[PDB]
């Protein structure tokens, strides 16, 4: 149905993302029982380690444009991936390196996320009907590689203990490689137009000296989350002011504040969410017993299930009201089921969990898929490095909201926890529900200024 | 996934016994082991446990006297038994749930030893 390099590019997507996500899946646990940070700090920790993985995307497609190509800076995006997975496995026996390499995973996403999507959008002539369907099957390649990881990182971690599971994640970005380059020969008239001149050195080495500084910096952050957020804090508030004062921009920038409460709230998937699970839901379903971190891989499942589904199947900010309905109704399921639903123990069934992640799930197929993607049909280099910033700030905002559910590490009774855990997720549905009006009330308003 | 228990036993009143869980695969370092007993005619009911944080919980009637503790090394969760009174006596069982929290009851555990027979008996010297 499709060319030969989609399938070469869906195969590269699928595993980088299984690298990424079992990283993921994991990261939140790995702070609290091998780090011993407490879930406070575990859940600020992530959210800044997740804020640079996204806030730096911008640069590997300026990298990818501009300085070394499309393909080139694929390969150099996965190997300094599989560096920092590699990396991180040794951090078990030198902890002192856990920044670094989480510095380098973060830096290495920045190089690659843009580019295998923009390859793709290359292998198609320019109005081919196939593209639609072709994204759309990407999308799955992520998920499908995000299902995989989320659901047997964990198991595997409590197997083998954490060495594996990273290492694990670094030959999931070997055999990206190598599929790379055993289907090179596939895109050998695909790519940007630096693809096709010779390497420039100088470039390659401003892009090497440039990404070091990076993993040093971005180290420094995660540290030290107090000055991250005081760096987040003005630049966003500066980029805000030179972008006011400089009405289709007017649309592009409401949107990008909705996004980012809907940002804000995926956040919770790996870190308050996570640990409601493990807390206050029973641990089998089906009769088979399960990891309660593996819940976090019913994210994809849905998304796989349900992308084809509504590809079959108002416009713009209607779209992006419909997904905030639905991300407020996840947390308002998680809070019901905790006041409501719950056992004389205090334990809930994952069968709530389960529906929980089929709103988010929803919420995320009409927001985040549909972003940037209809941002760009609203508009430039300045709204896309602030629409990774935004997201970036979204993140650190997220761990931050996490940490109200944080758990003492002497606390046993779930019946101590559940009170938190739904104060906290019925504040968060009240409070995006809000959101979600305002939305549909402007969304007229917004319909009119996209004419 | 399967724990194995041992050093249950026969004792006299006040007397004292260690009961121990191990698992097999898993490490058992991300698991809350409760132990649970049954008495003769009753169900199994939440004695002590530890979670996978060091967090403690106790039924009230064995509070000082029973002590969980946990041997990250050994990979082994121990149960000591001091001041044993006859109506100690039960088959013990260790149970394992992810995580920190200690639900109290069976339900909330997945993983579950086969049980051990605690016998303590009246029995006294003759003064
Ligand atoms: C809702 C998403 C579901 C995720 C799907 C899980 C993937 C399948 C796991 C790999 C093959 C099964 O391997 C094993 O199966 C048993 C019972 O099935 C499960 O359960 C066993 O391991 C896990 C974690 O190691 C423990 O928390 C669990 O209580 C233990 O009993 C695990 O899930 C899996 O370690
Ligand atoms: C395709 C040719 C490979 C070029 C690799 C050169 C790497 C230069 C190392 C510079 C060290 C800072
Ligand atoms: C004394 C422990 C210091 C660990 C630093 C690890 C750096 C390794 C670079 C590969
Ligand atoms: C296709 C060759 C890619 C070169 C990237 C290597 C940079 C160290
Ligand atoms: C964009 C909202 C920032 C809030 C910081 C407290």
């Not at chain 1, 690659?112 to 198609?124: Q, T």
């Not at chain 1, 549909?370 to 993140?395: D, E, K, N, P, R």
């Amino acid at each position: 149905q499709q060319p030969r390099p989609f399938f070469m590019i869906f195969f590269v997507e699928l595993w980088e993302r299984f690298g990424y996500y079992g990283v993921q899946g994991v990261l939140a646990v790995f702070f609290v029982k091998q780090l011993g940070f407490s879930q406070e700090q575990a859940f600020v920790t992530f959210g800044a380690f997740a804020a640079l993985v996204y806030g730096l995307i911008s640069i590997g497609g300026y990298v990818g444009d501009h300085l070394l190509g499309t393909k080139r800076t694929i390969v150099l995006g996965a190997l300094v991936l599989a560096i920092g997975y590699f990396m991180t496995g040794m951090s078990l026996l030198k902890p002192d390196l856990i920044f670094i390499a989480l510095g380098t995973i973060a830096v290495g996403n920045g190089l690659f996320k843009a580019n295998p999507a923009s390859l793709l959008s290359k292998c198609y002539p320019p109005k081919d009907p196939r593209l639609d369907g072709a994204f759309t099957l990407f999308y799955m390649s992520i998920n499908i590689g995000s299902l995989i990881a989320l659901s047997l990182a964990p198991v595997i971690a409590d197997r083998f203990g954490y060495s594996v599971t990273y290492n694990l994640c670094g030959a999931g970005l070997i055999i990206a490689l190598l599929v790379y380059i055993a289907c090179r020969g596939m895109v050998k008239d695909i790519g940007s137009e630096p693809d096709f001149r010779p390497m420039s050195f100088s470039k390659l080495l401003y892009v090497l000296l440039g990404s070091v500084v990076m993993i040093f910096v971005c180290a420094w952050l995660m540290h030290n989350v107090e000055v991250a957020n005081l760096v987040l804090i003005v630049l966003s508030i500066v980029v805000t002011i030179i972008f006011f004062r400089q009405n289709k921009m007017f649309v592009a920038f409401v949107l990008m504040l909705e996004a980012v409460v809907f940002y804000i709230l995926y956040a919770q998937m790996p870190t308050s969410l996570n640990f409601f699970a493990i807390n206050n839901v029973h641990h089998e379903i089906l009769g088979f017993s399960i990891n309660p971190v593996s819940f976090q891989a019913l994210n994809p499942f849905w998304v796989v299930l349900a992308s084809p589904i509504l590809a079959g199947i108002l416009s713009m900010p209607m779209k992006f009201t419909l997904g905030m309905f639905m991300c407020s109704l996840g947390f308002l399921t998680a809070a019901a089921a905790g006041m409501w639903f719950a056992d004389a123990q205090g334990l809930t069934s994952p069968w709530f969990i389960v529906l929980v992640y089929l709103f988010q799930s929803l919420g995320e197929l009409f927001i985040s898929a549909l972003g940037l993607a209809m941002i760009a049909a609203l508009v430039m280099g300045f709204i896309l490095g602030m629409w990774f910033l935004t997201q970036a700030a979204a993140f650190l905002l997220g761990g931050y909201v996490a940490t109200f559910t944080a758990v003492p590490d002497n606390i046993t009774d779930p019946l101590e926890t559940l009170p938190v855990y739904t104060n906290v997720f019925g504040k968060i549905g009240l409070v995006t529900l809000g959101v979600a009006v305002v939305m549909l009330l402007m969304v007229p308003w917004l319909k009119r200024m996209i004419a | 996934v399967q724990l194995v228990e041992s050093g249950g036993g026969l004792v006299q009143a006040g007397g004292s016994l260690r009961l121990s869980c191990a698992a097999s695969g898993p490490t058992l370092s991300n698991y809350a082991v409760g132990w649970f007993r049954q008495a003769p005619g009753k169900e199994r009911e939440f004695v002590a446990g530890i979670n996978w944080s060091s967090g403690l919980r106790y039924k009230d009637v064995v509070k000082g006297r029973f002590t969980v503790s946990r041997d990250n090394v050994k990979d082994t969760v121990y149960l000591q038994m001091n001041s044993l009174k006859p109506e100690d006596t039960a088959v013990y069982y260790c149970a394992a749930r992810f995580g920190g929290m200690l639900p109290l009851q069976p339900s909330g555990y997945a993983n579950w030893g086969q049980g051990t027979q605690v016998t303590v008996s009246s029995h006294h010297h003759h003064h």
